[PDB]
Amino acid sequence: VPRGSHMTTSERVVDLLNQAALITNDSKITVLKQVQELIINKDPTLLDNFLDEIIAFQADKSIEVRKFVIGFIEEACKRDIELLLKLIANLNMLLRDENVNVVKKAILTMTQLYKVALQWMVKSRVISELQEACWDMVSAMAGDIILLLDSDNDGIRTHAIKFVEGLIVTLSPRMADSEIPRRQEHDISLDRIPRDHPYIQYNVLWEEGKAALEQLLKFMVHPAISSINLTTALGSLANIARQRPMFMSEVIQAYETLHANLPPTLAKSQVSSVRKNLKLHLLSVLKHPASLEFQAQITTLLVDLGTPQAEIARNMP
């Protein structure tokens, strides 16, 4: 940026915003991403001042522009979670976009923001009626995504499964045998929530995580479940069993059920694709220290699927 060193950041943001206004194609995203860097990272004190100007692009006709806005909402809220107070309506409206790729993007962002909102609620010294209303909105959007398991669109359903998976994990406690991904080491989980919190009720969240698991387990035995959604659900259960091994029993049971009752609507190559992923995920759960308790059952299913005795041993301890 020539003479970039003589500009105030604010001026440069204003110039860039008027520049983006001028650009009639997707290259406006490059400019808008520069604005994002300036107001979220370089000088976060400008974030509030320029929020409405970036959020205005939520009405852009371009798919890629609307997706950028969702990504911007995501970063803005991670920078200053209080911004969720004024951005949760916008996020939920983007969840309801006419375009499925924009909707899927909103699902992925909620998978990130739900846990951030919950931590904010947990940590807060005091909670305004507005913040309470914000959590109600977040929670209701989470419920809406759970209902997207019943969408008629395969891609939407795959994304809903991943959101549901993340929720089940957030709403259950880490334990001694939990295998936690490095990126997620600091994520809130149930055990981190004081039992005597003024607003967020531990026991309610527990029952919500359990009911989310139950919905996922029900979804999996739906007679018309698609090849992709079933393989997604199988992977999600393996991640859940590994991160939250108190559910390992339910996960193994679901694998046994599927193995005995393949949905009959899968085409031949889809059956093969699914069976290959059942084996893969059984092997994965076998490797986890907490599978000691289910080892005879996992072994039996793996032999059934045509897994050589030698391959099983490789995945043992």
Binding site: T158, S226, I228, S269, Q270
Partner: protein
């Protein structure tokens, strides 16, 4: 549409496909999942073997020394020369960190390796990547045919309204039309 095509050695099936896709305006990268690079040699039980760190040009010169005549005859020098014009060396899938919409593999063993690899990476985004297999025999003629079928599939996918919602129906049509099976799964970034 950002595509990756993956074979075993990143020499033949994936490079034929890289070439056709690239020429037809797709964003494409190509990889191999094998432990090492294999090229045909003087007998079926005597392949030439290389590290993935070795350049197509180094393989060319090595083979030009060994038997100029055999490796002109079996199209391998020409293949290596074609490859060089695309990129300097074969690439291991397990070493790359790029994102794709669609990963096409050229045989079930390669499909298994791609899936094992992606399923062992930590998910950070939960953005799905579709992985589709077509069994293609590792010779020049089947590679060419396989590449055109892959190009046809990628073309269809690009014309669809909603790739995730229509890809399985499309693959089923392709199975019926081609008589070849298309395994299909998703992995997550």
């Amino acid at each position: 549409l950002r595509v990756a095509v993956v074979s075993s050695s990143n020499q033949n099936r994936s490079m034929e496909a890289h070439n056709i896709l690239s020429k037809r305006g797709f964003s494409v990268r190509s990889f191999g999942t094998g432990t090492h690079v294999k090229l045909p040699g003087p007998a079926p039980d005597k392949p030439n073997v290389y590290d993935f760190k070795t350049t197509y040009d180094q393989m060319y010169n090595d083979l030009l020394r060994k038997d100029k005549e055999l490796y002109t005859q079996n199209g391998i020098l020409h293949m290596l020369d074609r490859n060089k014009r695309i990129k300097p060396r074969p690439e291991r899938f397990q070493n790359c960190k790029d994102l794709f919409d669609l990963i096409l593999t050229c045989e079930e063993r390669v499909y298994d390796q791609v899936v094992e690899d992606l399923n062992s990476r930590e998910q950070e985004t939960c953005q799905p990547v579709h992985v589709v297999n077509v069994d293609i025999q590792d010779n020049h003629e089947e590679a060419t045919l396989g590449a055109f079928l892959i190009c046809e599939l990628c073309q269809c996918i690009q014309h669809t309204e909603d790739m995730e919602n229509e890809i399985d129906e499309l693959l089923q049509e392709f199975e019926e039309k081609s008589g070849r099976t298309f395994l299909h799964t998703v992995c997550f970034y």
